[PDB]
């Protein structure tokens, strides 16, 4: 009768299936308490730990849940028995930056933020220290309210506060040196009788600071490049273009805007090639998600001019 829909903070809502395991995504949206303005920003994904797939409005979530091992087998080289899929509320990857940039809906801001925060904290955002220090300061206000000196002034910025305001990939070596500027800026949000108190203004300010990160809004895919030397990669694909991360470190390897690179289908459906326009070099990415990536690149580039 019912099914869990998660948000990227890990919370979830219970929904009623009008047509049982035949219930569509579109129905489910309407199944929850949501308008077609609100539904403009997100849809349903199905994700297990190592594969996330955006659903069409006419797909049937539960059957994809049922059919996951073969989906996994079609799309990845994972062991099927070690992944459990769940349904998620997450950003529509087609959502143009320009349209998002006008978002005023509290609910949408929240879904979008919980997702941005997850991405920030896991290391999928590369941005300079200044940017990271700003976001951390916003997280402090959001999670702990006004700066209050009695508790903080440094000594209450222990690696476990920190853990929750900076990317996990910066937290052992970079961020211990940012702790002063983080508190300074945190003091200014609380001290600012001009910048708004409210939970959705902070969340929105948070998204504002994310909008320029190159990988913002990307859907990730896993893959490999053969420089015997194999580099495991996340392929990021977004409204701005194509991005490769190291799977281990999250180090950004390359970022390419639509127009400054072209792609070719591999000889088989399990790889694709990227030719640099300026660097005049080529590389191949191996991943059984090749067809996905390539269609998302055609579709998102076409959303331009």
């Amino acid at each position: 009768e019912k099914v869990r829909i998660y948000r990227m903070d890990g919370s979830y809502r219970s929904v009623e299936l009008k047509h049982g395991n035949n219930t569509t995504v579109q129905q489910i949206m309407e199944g929850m308490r949501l308008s077609q303005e609100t539904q403009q920003y997100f849809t349903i994904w199905i994700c297990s730990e190592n594969l996330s797939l955006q659903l069409k409005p006419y797909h049937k979530p539960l059957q994809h849940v049922r059919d996951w091992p073969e989906i996994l087998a079609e799309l990845t080289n994972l062991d099927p028995q070690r992944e459990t899929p769940q349904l998620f509320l997450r950003r529509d990857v087609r959502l143009p930056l320009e349209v998002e940039k006008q978002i005023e809906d509290p609910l949408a801001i929240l879904i979008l933020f919980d997702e941005a925060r997850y991405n920030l904290l896991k290391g999928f955002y590369t941005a300079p220290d200044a940017k990271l220090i700003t976001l951390a300061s916003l997280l402090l206000q959001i999670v702990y309210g006004n700066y209050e000196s009695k508790k903080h002034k440094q000594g209450f910025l222990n690696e476990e506060n920190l853990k929750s305001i900076v990317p996990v990939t910066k937290l052992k070596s970079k961020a211990p040196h940012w702790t002063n500027r983080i508190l300074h800026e945190y003091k200014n949000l609380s001290t600012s009788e001009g910048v708004s108190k409210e939970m959705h203004h902070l969340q929105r300010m948070f998204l504002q600071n994310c909008w320029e990160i190159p990988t913002y809004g990307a859907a990730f895919f896993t893959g490999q490049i053969f420089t015997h030397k194999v580099i495991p990669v996340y392929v990021g694909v977004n409204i701005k273009g194509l991005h490769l991360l190291n799977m281990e470190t999250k180090a950004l390897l390359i970022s390419l805007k639509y127009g400054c690179f072209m792609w070719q289908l591999g000889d088989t459906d399990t790889c694709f090639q990227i030719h640099s326009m300026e660097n005049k070099m080529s590389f191949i990415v191996h991943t059984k998600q090749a067809g996905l990536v390539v269609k998302l690149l055609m579709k998102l580039n076409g959303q331009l001019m």
């Binding site: 797939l53 989906i71 079609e74 990857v93 996905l292 269609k295 998302l296 579709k299």
Partner: peptide, 7 residues
């Protein structure tokens, strides 16, 4: 055709 086109 339909059940395998994501995104």
């Amino acid at each position: 055709s339909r059940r395998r086109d994501y995104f």
